[PDB]
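Example complex used in Figure S2.
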Amino acid sequence: RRKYQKKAAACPDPSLSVWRPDIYFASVSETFETKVDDYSQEWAAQTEK
Amino acid sequence: AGILFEDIFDVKDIDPEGKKFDRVSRLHCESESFKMDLILDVNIQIYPVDLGDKFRLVIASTLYEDGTLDDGEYNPTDDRPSRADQFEYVMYGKVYRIEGDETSTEAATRLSAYVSYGGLLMRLQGDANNLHGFEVDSRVYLLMKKLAF
Amino acid sequence: KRITTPYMTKYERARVLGTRALQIAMCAPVMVELEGETDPLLIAMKELKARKIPIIIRRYLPDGSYEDWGVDELIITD
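Predicted assembly (276 residues):
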């Protein structure tokens, strides 16, 4: 019955539902992480040269 | 000597893009001893340049030719006999971009230099071997003097 | 067990620097070395910079629970 972990039992909750945003650092929203990761992919290609 | 660059240029075209700012002429040039171009803005009331005028160009980091000291502060009341002002037209401003056509390599053979002399710009594109001392936000002098031959 | 904001919000700073400026005025004891100004708010704002204001803040949660923060503990922004 290990497919209760292959199929995840739910989605993992957001980092603002768990781990409230004023106390736990880097608990940002899930569209803010995509913006920061796209910018860290672009910056590491434009700061290289 | 704190001479970051020194060459002899020849004006081939004046303001081809056609923007015509007052008191300021844009001077596209080519070089002689290097393989470079030059896109410089002058002040045309005081130091007039026409097309077909050769003039030597010096970009230096300090004006004191007795050692690189790089003071920064402008004193009109002090004059030293070791200035590099045997030239005629002297500007001052800082380098704001350098760019090149690198393809996963470092310092490709066509490097640029964008200097902003208080508002008057400059593009000195050429080989990377001739533009070593240009770092970004380095405050360099411009020194030019009209040749006649 | 105190899990609230480590930082001092603007309303916190308003009430602290207001009461402490009235706790400088009404001939109350001043607690910093000064140069001779005459406005209570400048005294109470130069005491916040020097971590000298001794106030405890009862941050009420909506239940009725209160946490006791000291002004010394709260990181003020610059």
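Residues 24 and 34 of chain A are 19 Å apart (CA to CA). The first helix of chain A runs from residue 3 to 6.
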